[PDB]
C-alpha cells in the first residue's frame, strides 16, 4: 500500500514539463490525491530515511502560533531557513494561521480549539474547518501556504481528515506533509477522544523539480517496508504535546537520499 | 462518462448513516473526488433536467459580488430564499468573499481579477486561488461557503480548475457546483485566452440527504445521453457577460425530478 510512491512514480511518467517561480523547472500534474488508512499503520515513508524530528517539531511549531525560525533553530530543525529574513522572521504563516487567524473586529481566531471543540461537541458538524489562506496576509508571508485548507470528519468514533495542498514539491515536501498531518490526525483524534481514520491528501500543482528525479528514480526502485507505529504520551491539551511524547516504532526506512531545495 | 452519477450510486450503496445541522438525516461519505474533461462536453447532467438558468444567474450573481437574493428575484431565481433575512441579506457569503475580502489595510481583495491577471501574466503560477472561507467573517454569513477554495492551473494553454467543497447535497447541491464551476472555467479561458481542460471537483462531506433517496434510485435507473457543448458571445471582461451570452447547445435531459431542500 504506496499511495505516496505511486504518485510518484505517476507524475514522472505522465507530468508535464512546467517552469515555475524557483526557476528550477519540473514535470507537474494537477489535481492528484491520495489516501491513506491511519489505523493500518503511520505514513511515514520506508522507501527512503525521512526526518522525522524535523516534521514533529515543524508541527510542534504550527501549533505553537510561532513564525520566527529560531525555536526551530533551538531544537535542531533548519526546513524554513531559506525564506526567512535576517531576524528569522517568516510572516503571519501556518502557525500563526492556525491558533490567531485576526477577525474584523480584532479579536484573534484559533481555528485549532475551534476545530477540537467541535469534534468533541458536534461531530457530525460539516464545519470542522482549518484554513491558512489568509488572502488579506498573504502578500506578508514568506511562502503562501502550501497545505493550505483541511478540514475534519467523524465516523463511528473515527476521525478522519483532509487536506487541500494547493502547491507540492513531490520528493522534498510531500514526505513531510503526509507525515505532518497525519501526526496532527493521532493528536487531534487523541484530544477529542477518537480513535483515527483515512488521511485523505489532495492535491493541486503536484510537481517534481527538475532536479530531484535522480533521486525520486532512486527511491521508486526500492521496495516498501511495513509502515511504523506511531505513540503519543498522554496530555491535557494538544498545546502541550512535547517532541518527547511522539514516539514511532519500528520504522525500519531504506537509506536517506540527498537533494536540494528549490528557493 | 458519468463521473456524478457514478459518486451518488457509490454513496448511496456505501455512505454511513449521519445525523446533521437540519435535522434531516443523510448518508455520507468523506473525501471523493470527480473528474471532468471540459473539451468533451458541458457536464451539466442529462438523468435529470437540471434548471441551468439558476445556475446561470447564480454565478452571475456571484460575479456582481451581491450577497442580497433581490438580483436573483429579479430574474426569476428563488435558490436562496430558505436562508435569507426578511430583507433578502444572506451576509458576506461566495460574491462578497469573491469580489471585495476585506484586507485588514481597509482596502478590499478582487480575487476573481488576481487570478485572471495571474492567468494572462503567470500562467505556471502555483498560487491561482480563490478562497471564500473568510475565516473571521464565517459567523456573519447564513451558511459557511461549501464550495469554499478553488484553484486554476495551466498546461499548453489549457486551463484546469480544482474546487475543494467541504459539504455536498449530492442530489440537489452539486449538479449545480459542478455546472456553476464548468461555467466559470469556461469564462475565465475566454478572458485569458485559453482553452478548457479539466474540472476537478473534490468533496468533504459527501452526503445523501435520506428524503432524496427515492430521486436518487430514480435518476441512477437511466441512461445518460451526450452533453451538451456551451458557447459564450464575446466580452471584454468577465464582468460583463450576460445571462444572454450563455447559450447550451442540444441540452436534451430526462425528465426533472423534483426534491425538498434541506434548510
Ligand atoms: N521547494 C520547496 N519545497 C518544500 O517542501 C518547502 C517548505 C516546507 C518545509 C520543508 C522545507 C525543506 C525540506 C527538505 O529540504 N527536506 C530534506 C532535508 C530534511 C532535513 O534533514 O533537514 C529531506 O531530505 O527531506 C522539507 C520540508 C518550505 N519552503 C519550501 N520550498
Ligand atoms: N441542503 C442545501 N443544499 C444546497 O445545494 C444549498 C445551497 C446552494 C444553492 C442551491 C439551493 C437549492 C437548490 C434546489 O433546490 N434545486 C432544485 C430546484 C431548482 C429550481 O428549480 O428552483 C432542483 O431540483 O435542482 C439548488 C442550488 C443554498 N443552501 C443550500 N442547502
Ligand atoms: O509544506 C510545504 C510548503 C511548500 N511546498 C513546496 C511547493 C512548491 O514546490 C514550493 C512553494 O512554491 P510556490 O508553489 O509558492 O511557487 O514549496 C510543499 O511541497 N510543502
Ligand atoms: O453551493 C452549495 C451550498 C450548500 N450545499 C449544501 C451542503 C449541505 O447539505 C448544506 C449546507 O449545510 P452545512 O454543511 O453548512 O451544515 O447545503 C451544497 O451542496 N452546494
Redesign the pocket.
Known sequence: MTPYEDLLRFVLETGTPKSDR?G?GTRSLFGQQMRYDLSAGFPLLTT?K??FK??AY?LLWFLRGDSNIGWLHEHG????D??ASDTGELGPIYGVQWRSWPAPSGEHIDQISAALDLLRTDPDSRRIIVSAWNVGEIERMA?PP?HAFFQFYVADGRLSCQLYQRSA?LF??????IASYALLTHMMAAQAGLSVGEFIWTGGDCHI?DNHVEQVRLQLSREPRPYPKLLLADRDSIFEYTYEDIVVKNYDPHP????????
Open positions: 524557483t528550477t527512503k525521512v526526518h524535523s516534521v515543524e530543525v533548519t526546513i524554513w531559506e525564506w511562502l502550501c514539491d522534498l515536501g510531500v514526505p513531510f506533509n523539480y536517506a537520499i540527498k537533494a536540494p531545495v528549490a528557493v
